[PDB]
Amino acid sequence: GSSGSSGGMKTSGKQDEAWIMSRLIKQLTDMGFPREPAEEALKSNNMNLDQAMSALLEKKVDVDKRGLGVTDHNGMAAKSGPSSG
Numbered sequence: 001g002s003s004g005s006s007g008g009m010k011t012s013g014k015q016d017e018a019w020i021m022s023r024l025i026k027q028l029t030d031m032g033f034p035r036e037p038a039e040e041a042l043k044s045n046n047m048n049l050d051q052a053m054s055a056l057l058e059k060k061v062d063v064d065k066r067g068l069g070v071t072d073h074n075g076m077a078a079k080s081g082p083s084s085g
Contacts, residue, residue: 017047024049027068028056 013019021042027049028038037056045051053066 021047024052028053030069031066032064 024042025035025038029035033056041052041055
């Protein structure tokens with residue numbers, strides 16, 4: 001036995017660049033950089049990721065390289081298109 005039931009709903013919260021700023025940070029933070037700089041550069045990088053990242057790495061030369069998570073190139077598909085003439 002299980003009858004229908006209602007609950008609470010919501011919508012996209014106020015649209016403020018402030019809260020958004022984090023979004024971009026989440027990434028930089030995932031890589032291996034503090035929010036301190038990622039928050040300073042970004043604002044100066046016109047809210048850019050690639051731009052900031054490079055601006056944060058340019059500082060010190062590390063061994064590791066850039067990349068987004070798995071960053072595993074994709075583009076395969078079993079298919080064949082033979083010609084006739």
